[PDB]
Design a protein around this nucleic acid. Structure first.
Ligand code: MG
Ligand code: MG
Ligand code: MG
Ligand code: MG
Ligand code: MG
Ligand code: MG
Ligand code: MG
Ligand code: MG
Ligand code: MG
Ligand code: MG
Ligand code: MG
Ligand code: MG
Ligand code: MG
Ligand code: MG
Ligand code: MG
Ligand code: MG
Ligand code: MG
Ligand code: MG
Lengths: 62, 129, 62, 88, 106
RNA sequence: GAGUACGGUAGAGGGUGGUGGAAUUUCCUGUGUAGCGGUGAAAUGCGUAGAUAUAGGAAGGAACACCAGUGGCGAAGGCGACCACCUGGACUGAUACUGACACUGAGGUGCGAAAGCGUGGGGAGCAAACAGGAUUAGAUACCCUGGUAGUCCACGCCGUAAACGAUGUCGACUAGCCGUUGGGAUCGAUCUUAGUGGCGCAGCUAACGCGAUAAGUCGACCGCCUGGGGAGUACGGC
């Protein structure tokens, strides 16, 4: 979420560095996850669906 | 909780002939030994062996003849919840007498034909065809 | 972890703790480092203890 | 609740054949001591039901063991019940 | 019997009584009946964040094998001390002696 | 079979206190100005009485990101900040010990989400009821701006849920393959245990499908069903 400037490179490489750092931080995901309250039933349902999708992907890898 | 071990003998034999196995091993008893002896005498099994050392185990060798098990149907009649007792004239005839039904008489564990010959009724134990 | 160095790890070797913390002060998931479940479980509480002692930061911003 | 030292003391003073711990008397003594040592804990923590389940389990186990012992030998049952000093 | 690894850090302005402060504390462990098996010091360190508007503190760790009353009095002394600033303990079932790390570098 | 003694592991198992950081809101102060907020588009609302953004300070309440997983623990309901104290159970290894001391269980006895009730506290966010602005033929709704009980704590009551695996508890047998949690043994491989998942042979099933965590083969005991409505309602008892 913060990057320094040094050694007079063009103001595009640092921009892509900042973008990459922000998307490594995952700020957008967390700020989207706080827009509305998710009741726990929906949370367990989403986690179960993600788990079954992940296991299906891993099985289909062979 | 092992309320009845003789039904466990019968179930082990049945499940082993469904799975196409040759030998069956279980804990032994003086009633299981008699049942195995009468089964062998009728030709439904090949042999039975009993081990030593306070925990003897009964090992039964199964016959197959063709590609089907020799023991087609076996079922326990007098469970510890009924205790069926029969007279001489009320002894069942399984499959018109083609099979046999085991009876415990005061003369020991034997077959229905032997009981009819001796004129003795008793406690029906299981039926085999 | 298993061969020679410390079968059980305390929150002492910060040379090992800082190896398992992201640039923003978060804890790296086990599936990324490939560590084991027991070691991850004790490592998380080691980081939390060290973080309360103000050795390690709650957030990179603060 | 019990630790090693007092458990050893109980099995020492309640043993039967110099090296046994499975005899009914030892089990009843251990259960009774643990129940007594748990009563004062339950005096202060009224809202701890999960441990009270184990306490009731020990109570039932002791009752079963006492019933078996009274079935086996009457005189040993009376001696044991007198030494622990409990109703039944 | 009941070991306790305790790490206590103190205000930088008073980072000179800490040399004597431990003797105001270790004084207990002997008449309680306990022995210290480790004591170290790497004080005057940098803080990760602001703890009541400071950024530095003097650290000290030590092991104690004491009774409940010694624990109570030491934690009460921490609570009512003006410096205190932080306390924490790690009750364990063994003994450790060989420092923590010092500096492995030159 | 069941249980006891002895070492060692893992865990959001329960209870009582203390302590953390972030973020929201409210209040105070500083420069600075005319917009902020919200929507499908708006409006209600807040605005030079200086907002939002921003800097500094203060109080107060609640929840515990990252770890986090077909992961763990608990009889079920359920249980995620850290620390100490009190405490229950499970798993694992060898030896000794007790010698059937067991299973199930009509009655009864307890525990039992959320909402709700009583007394006393507290009250930041959220939000039944409610007020206003929209949309609409109407809109007692969906949407937006606010907002009370409640959500939080102590004690007591209430006994209910798609309280579900829509699958009662206990025990024994029956091909195999790929994961995973936490312990052992042998020489990364193999072997064996108690859980937790995905496929699948016989077998079962009306079919779907289940398939060593059976809905297969058998035992022990209990609970329950007998066409759809009326109706889990009336009357009586508690
Ligand atoms: Mg402001
Ligand atoms: Mg029962
Ligand atoms: Mg009942
Ligand atoms: Mg009941
Ligand atoms: Mg409630
Ligand atoms: Mg109330
Ligand atoms: Mg009130
Ligand atoms: Mg609204
Ligand atoms: Mg009301
Ligand atoms: Mg119901
Ligand atoms: Mg549930
Ligand atoms: Mg039902
Ligand atoms: Mg079963
Ligand atoms: Mg399948
Ligand atoms: Mg069916
Ligand atoms: Mg009808
Ligand atoms: Mg009614
Ligand atoms: Mg009524």
């Amino acid at each position: 979420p913060a990057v320094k400037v040094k050694e007079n490179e063009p103001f595009d490489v640092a921009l892509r560095r900042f973008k990459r750092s922000c998307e490594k931080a995952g700020v957008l995901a967390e700020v989207r996850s706080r827009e509305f309250y998710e009741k726990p039933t929906a949370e367990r349902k989403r986690k179960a669906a993600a788990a079954v999708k992940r296991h299906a992907k891993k099985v289909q890898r062979e | 909780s092992m309320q009845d071990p003789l039904a466990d003998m019968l179930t082990r034999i049945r499940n082993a002939q469904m799975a196409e196995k040759t030998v069956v091993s279980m804990p032994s008893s003086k009633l299981k030994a008699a049942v195995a002896k009468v089964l062998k005498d009728e030709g439904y099994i090949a042999d039975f062996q009993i081990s030593s050392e306070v925990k003897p185990q009964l090992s039964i060798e199964l016959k197959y003849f063709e590609g089907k098990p020799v023991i087609e149907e076996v079922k326990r009649i007098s469970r510890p919840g009924l205790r069926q007792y029969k007279s001489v004239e009320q002894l069942p005839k399984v499959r018109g007498g083609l099979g046999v039904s085991i009876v415990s008489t005061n003369k020991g564990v034997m077959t229905d034909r032997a009981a009819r010959a001796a004129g003795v009724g008793g406690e029906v134990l299981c039926t085999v065809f | 972890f298993t061969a020679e160095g410390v079968k059980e790890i305390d929150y002492k070797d910060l040379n090992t703790l800082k190896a398992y913390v992201s640039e923003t002060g978060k804890i790296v998931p086990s599936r990324i480092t490939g560590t084991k479940a027991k070691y991850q479980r004790q490592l998380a509480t080691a980081i939390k203890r060290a973080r309360y002692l103000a050795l390690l930061p709650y957030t990179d911003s603060h | 609740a019990l630790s090693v030292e007092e458990k050893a003391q109980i099995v020492n003073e309640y043993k039967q054949a110099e090296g046994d711990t499975g005899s009914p008397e030892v089990q009843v003594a251990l259960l009774s001591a643990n129940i007594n040592k748990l009563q004062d804990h339950f005096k202060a923590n009224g809202k701890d039901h999960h441990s009270r389940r184990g306490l009731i389990r020990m109570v039932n186990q002791r009752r079963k063991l006492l019933d078996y012992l009274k079935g086996k030998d009457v005189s040993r049952y009376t001696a044991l019940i007198g030494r622990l000093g409990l109703r039944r | 019997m009941r070991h306790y690894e305790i790490v206590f850090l103190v205000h930088p302005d008073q980072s000179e009584q800490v040399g004597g402060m431990v003797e105001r504390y270790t004084k207990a462990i002997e008449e309680d009946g306990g022995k210290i098996h480790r004591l170290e010091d790497w004080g005057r360190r940098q803080l990760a964040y602001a703890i009541n508007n400071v950024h530095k503190a003097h650290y000290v760790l030590m092991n104690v094998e004491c009774s409940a009353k010694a624990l109570a009095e030491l934690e009460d002394n921490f609570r009512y001390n003006d410096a205190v600033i932080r306390n924490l303990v790690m009750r364990r079932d063994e003994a450790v002696t060989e420092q923590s790390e010092m500096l492995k570098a030159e």
